[PDB]
Swiss-Prot record, chains A, C:
The keyword Plastid does not apply. One of its GO terms (cellular component) is cytosol. Component of the translation initiation factor 2B (eIF2B) complex which is a heterodecamer of two sets of five different subunits: alpha, beta, gamma, delta and epsilon. Subunits alpha, beta and delta comprise a regulatory subcomplex and subunits epsilon and gamma comprise a catalytic subcomplex. Within the complex, the hexameric regulatory complex resides at the center, with the two heterodimeric catalytic subcomplexes bound on opposite sides. Residues 328-355 are annotated as: Disordered. GO terms for biological process: cytoplasmic translational initiation; regulation of translational initiation. It is found in: Cytoplasm, Cytosol. Belongs to the eIF-2B alpha/beta/delta subunits family. Its main location: cytoplasm. This is Translation initiation factor eIF2B subunit delta. Keywords: Acetylation, Cytoplasm, Initiation factor, Phosphoprotein, Protein biosynthesis, Repressor, Translation regulation. Residues 342-352 have a biased composition (Basic and acidic residues). The gene is GCD2. Present with 10300 molecules/cell in log phase SD medium.
UniProtKB/Swiss-Prot annotation, chain B:
One of its GO terms (biological process) is regulation of translational initiation. This is Translation initiation factor eIF2B subunit beta. Belongs to the eIF-2B alpha/beta/delta subunits family. Keywords: Cytoplasm, Initiation factor, Protein biosynthesis, Translation regulation. It is found in: Cytoplasm, Cytosol. InterPro entries: eIF2B_beta_subunit, IF-2B-related, IF_2B-like_C, M1Pi_N, NagB/RpiA_transferase-like. It comes from Saccharomyces cerevisiae (strain ATCC 204508 / S288c) (Baker's yeast). Acts as a component of the translation initiation factor 2B (eIF2B) complex, which catalyzes the exchange of GDP for GTP on the eukaryotic initiation factor 2 (eIF2) complex gamma subunit. Its guanine nucleotide exchange factor activity is repressed when bound to eIF2 complex phosphorylated on the alpha subunit, thereby limiting the amount of methionyl-initiator methionine tRNA available to the ribosome and consequently global translation is repressed. GO terms for molecular function: enzyme regulator activity; translation initiation factor activity. GO terms for cellular component: cytosol; eukaryotic translation initiation factor 2B complex; guanyl-nucleotide exchange factor complex; mitochondrion. Pfam families: IF-2B.
């Protein structure tokens, strides 16, 4: 199977809902694992760019590739060990890093597809139509959905607007690009970034590469830029069946600020991002990473410096724990643009029954 | 409609009425069971020939029952559910008798535009299904319920009168990895003995129990993590009728401190009728239990009530056997169980 | 020497800082103590009538009595063992029932008096003047102040009133009585009762003894009592240097309720109750009593039923604790009736530096 247990850093007295560590350096691997999965795992382990949306697409692509490479054996049938393989892959993924609802949905869809086609049809003809179908699905629930979202944004966003964004959600970046080049509008895009992740920075860079006026913002200096700000979009990850946004980093604070100061908050989301599972706080299900990211002085990601920090077990009780994903409130984000055009966050799972 | 038609065919109606009036029957579940039994009796014995007429008769009976007792919501609800069950089957039948498109499961424009079988067995089966549903609620809650409470968190419990809430608590407490401190509000004129019993049970279960008087809620509120209601009846917009005394104030306090307010009840307690008035549905208790003597107590007019009504603004979560729901969503659940015409009888 | 150790019931996990234990039935003491102090202590320990206002007066009276009875020894001066005696008395009081702010103030005053007259004067001339002075002081800062407060209230009350009241505060009783008798207005009195002490019941009884239209309610029954009703009055114990209401049990919740249902709250206080001690929660210093008060099953105080509960020590892991003194929020009460006619509670220590 690989490597299990034996990890640095304590279990911690505060916040221990999920397991904290997993394979990063490859040693003794099974002689049946597809390299693309391994590469993906390697990437995710230390990624800066992707967040929720592109990850799922990547996964889908990988799956497609696997299917293309797969052929029906003489002894075992098409539906004999494929499911087992999928399960193994899932387990590997989980071991690497906790997964999203979209991925789960995709898995479910795949499972359904497996059941649908009966093991009697010609093998070459089977996968030919399968990969086409999967492509079609991808086009529909992602690209077309993105387009729909863009169009929704278009009718709502006024002439000459100031937008404040967080994270590295691809859809928002696409929207901003559209605003810049295709429609041609006056845009002021303020992007906020945190210590361990340089997603905001990346977004800013991307904007620059197009030709947009960008203000770089931080958590320490928030109130100075608001007091002027008209419209705020948040980096969406998943909407729960209560009306709460399970999202990345200090978006909740921003939302609170928005609520305090005049204008309501807006959220752009996909039709398949919705979850039937329910939770109402950050303590419920936390996504964790290694405290090794916050040791060095900032500036850039790879530095390797000698200074003062570099003790987790050496000094007299030192805990340096952080959270990657937090909870955003219910009443504060009201706007939701999805595959079913219009709706609010109070409307929690009306689209879930409609599918 | 009087009881002239039902005298030798069905006699148990009078007994049911008696049970309702003098409070011989206790606990909403029991009432529901009784109602189910009555329905079964009606079905097995009576004659129909026509279907619409039968439906009308059923409606009339329901109305009569309501008139006999308004605080028995479960009774009403069960009847409504049965009617709904009947109705769909009837609709299906009509389509075959005659020999349609819809965007969703139900359509609004179908009301504006102009639209013998073995249904008895189906009706019988419906009752059985309802009974089964009534039987187990806690098994469909615990998979969602034991995910919210965490280590070193403090719970606050108004209304320990409900049998479901205690069970829910117990299930959470079972887990060895989970540890929590329990603060229990008493409720003086209606809930005291029950509260004491609850406390005793908690002690037996080997959990840290804190018995708190009704005045000492404010001082401990800086440490309070979650709020759970022992409600008796659920409604359309979100508002709930709680199982007697000391719920409203606590809820208000929670709202003030922005403490999360949970609610555990079930869909058989859920009603498709609106609580337009607090005064109409909420029944009041007894003056004798509070203070002794009678001649000076003519001057001392004491006010005491059984049931309590809490606005939907304070409560946010309604976990049932199906899953976790909101006050902004529960209406749809009711619709999925009780049909459009079945609301007014 | 006294008595030490041996405490009934469980000590609990939370709220452990102040004394809650002690002499209930006397056994072996020092053969020099004046019995009036002992009797007072016995009374205070098992009291159901007193509430902040009369206790201090009673203490003063006791002191006066002691002074009257006091005889100077032939050898030592007037103040040599007197201070020791006083200390012993204080210790006894604390053992019985913790000292209030008013009591502390009284003690301070006594100390000042002691300092004022140095040991040189004869016995019968000094104490003659002392007792008169003390009486004068009592007349000045207490009764007259109360009268002033009453008169202020008189002008403050309008036409057509419906009032909800709480506590065994003597001033409030006086006020209500005054309203009933000498004002002859359309006054309605609604009473709220508490579990630790039957104060509400006493108030009701007093009202009956005058002949007033009385509604009688509890802490739980409040959602239906409003459904016309306007004024809300509370009885305060002491106001701290912060400005927060440091008073008895069921007040804060009532105040909150009042705030919620439109109409604000008015509280009465004396111009001596103010303290220099700084605290912002009930956890700091609290009047905690034995769990014997929460044993009787409703109806009346002397009933004694063998129902369901009647054990504390034998029960494994069971904490039955109750609090008597609470700290109410600052912003919720608007009206404060003191020696300077009318003022806000945010003044805090405007009279403390004034002395």
């Amino acid at each position: 199977p690989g490597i299990s247990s034996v990890i640095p850093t304590v279990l911690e007295q505060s916040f221990d809902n999920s397991s904290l560590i997993s394979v990063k350096e490859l040693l003794l691997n099974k002689d049946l694992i597809h390299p693309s999965i391994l590469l993906l795992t390697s990437h995710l382990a230390h990624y800066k760019i992707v967040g929720s949306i592109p990850r799922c697409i990547a996964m889908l692509e990988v799956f497609q590739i696997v299917i293309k490479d797969y052929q029906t054996p003489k002894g075992t049938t098409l539906s004999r060990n494929l499911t087992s393989y999928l399960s193994h892959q899932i387990d590997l993924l989980k071991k690497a890093r906790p997964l999203s609802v979209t991925m789960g949905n995709a898995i479910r869809w795949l499972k359904q597809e497996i059941s649908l086609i009966d093991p009697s049809t010609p093998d070459k003809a089977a996968k030919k139509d399968l990969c086409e179908k999967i492509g079609q699905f991808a086009k529909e629930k992602i690209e077309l959905a993105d387009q729909l979202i863009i169009d929704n944004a278009s009718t709502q966003i006024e002439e000459s607007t100031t937008i404040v964004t967080y994270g590295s959600s691809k859809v928002l970046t696409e929207l901003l690009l559209h605003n810049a080049i295709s429609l041609k509008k006056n845009i002021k895009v303020i992007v906020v970034d945190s210590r361990p992740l340089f997603e905001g920075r990346k977004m800013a860079e991307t904007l620059r590469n197009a030709g947009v006026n960008v203000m770089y913002a931080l958590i320490t200096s928030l109130d100075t830029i608001f007091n002027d700000v008209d419209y705020v979009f948040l980096g969406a990850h998943s909407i729960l069946s209560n009306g709460f946004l399970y999202s990345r980093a200090g978006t909740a604070m921003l939302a609170m600020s928005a609520k305090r100061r005049n204008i309501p908050v807006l959220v752009c989301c996909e039709s398949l991002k919705f979850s039937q599972r329910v939770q109402l706080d950050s303590v419920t299900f936390n996504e964790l990473a290694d405290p090794n990211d916050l040791v060095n002085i900032d500036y850039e990601n790879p530095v390797e410096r000698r200074g003062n920090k570099g003790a987790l077990l050496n000094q007299f009780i030192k805990e340096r724990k952080f959270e990657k994903k937090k909870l955003a409130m219910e009443n504060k984000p009201k706007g939701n643009k999805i595959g079913g055009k219009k709706g609010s966050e109070g409307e929690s799972k009306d689209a879930s029954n409609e599918e | 409609h009087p009881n002239a038609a039902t005298s030798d065919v069905n006699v148990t109606i009078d007994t049911f009425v008696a049970k309702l009036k003098r409070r011989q029957v206790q606990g909403s579940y029991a009432i529901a069971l009784e109602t189910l039994q009555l329905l079964m009796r009606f079905i097995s014995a009576a004659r129909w020939n026509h279907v619409n007429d039968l439906i009308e008769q059923i409606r009339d009976l329901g109305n009569s029952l309501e008139k006999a007792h308004p605080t028995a919501f479960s009774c009403g609800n069960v009847i409504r559910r049965i009617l709904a069950v009947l109705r769909d089957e009837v609709e299906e039948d009509t389509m075959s008798t005659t020999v349609v498109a819809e965007p969703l499961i139900s359509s609004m424009f179908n009301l504006l535009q102009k639209p013998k079988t073995d249904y008895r067995q189906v009706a019988i089966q419906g009752i059985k299904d309802l009974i089964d549903e009534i039987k187990n609620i806690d098994e469909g809650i615990q998979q969602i319920a034991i995910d919210l409470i965490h280590d070193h968190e403090i719970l606050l419990t108004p209304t320990p009168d409900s049998k479901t809430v205690l069970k829910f608590l117990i299930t959470a407490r079972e887990r060895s990895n989970r540890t929590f401190t329990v603060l229990v509000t008493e409720g003086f004129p209606n809930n005291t003995k029950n509260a004491h019993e609850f406390a005793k049970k908690l002690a037996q279960h080997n959990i840290e129990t804190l018995v708190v008087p009704d005045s000492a809620v404010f001082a401990l509120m800086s440490r309070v993590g979650k709020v759970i209601i022992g409600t008796k009846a659920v409604f359309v917009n979100g508002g709930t009728i709680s199982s007697n005394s000391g719920v409203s104030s606590v809820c208000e306090c929670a709202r003030e401190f922005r403490t999360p307010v949970f609610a555990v009840a079930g869909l058989y307690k859920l009603s498709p009728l609106y609580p337009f008035d607090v005064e109409k549905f909420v029944e009041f208790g007894g003056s004798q239990r509070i203070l002794p003597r009678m001649d000076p107590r003519k001057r001392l007019d004491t006010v005491n009530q059984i049931t309590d009504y809490v606005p939907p603004e304070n409560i946010d979560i309604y976990i049932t056997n199906v899953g976790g729901f909101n006050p902004s969503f529960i209406y749809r659940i009711a619709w999925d169980n009780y049909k459009q015409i079945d609301v007014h009888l």
